[PDB]
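README: folding subset

This subset contains proteins for which both the sequence and a predicted structure token string are available. Records are stored as plain text. Below is the entry for Ryanodine receptor 2 (241 residues), shown exactly as it appears on disk.
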Amino acid sequence: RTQTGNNTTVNIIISTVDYLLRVQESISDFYWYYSGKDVIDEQGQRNFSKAIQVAKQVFNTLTEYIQGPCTGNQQSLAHSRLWDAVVGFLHVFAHMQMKLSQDSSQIELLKELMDLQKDMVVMLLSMLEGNVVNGTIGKQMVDMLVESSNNVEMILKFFDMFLKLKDLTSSDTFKEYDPDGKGVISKRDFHKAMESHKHYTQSETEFLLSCAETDENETLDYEEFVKRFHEPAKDIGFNVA
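--- output ---
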């Protein structure tokens, strides 16, 4: 952050934040390119993968900068343009999660994106590390959250929807539609099971039907379904909470 002895000082921390802002702007532009299109082609998925990996490395560099209550670095990020990048990333996360989850060819991209979100939340937690009551860092974070309110609401509804899924699956009323331990259930059985569950509304139910990949046998593996969705939600939502 500050080279005390040297004649001239360069803020490597601020430069890292600036690069994070540029890369998140590029990622947002590429997502806006792919927003209207129904499916993302192989080249688009590869470019997203490379960009997400770069952003993940930058987030790790920032969290290693700020961990070990480095108060100077924490204040530097608080006063930097980090919040705008976090806001853009929150919009990207809130929309791309809904877009990719329905498609069954973007599982790898969804995993990469959900890991990037976890690293971002870890960076925010390291920001709050060593907090004080009524601190400027907390003020700026709640300002950022209020600015990105709608995207946070979308992410939090997504997480709650995929967190109730494990309770639904472990419910006995589901294991009577699946009496034997085959682990495979039909589309109609899944739909009427979630209707008997009554904790999922019609919109949540139809979204979960759409996010479910079925074969010509009309039956899917709910074990792999919950393994795919509950675990990322469980690990990211705990850090969010």
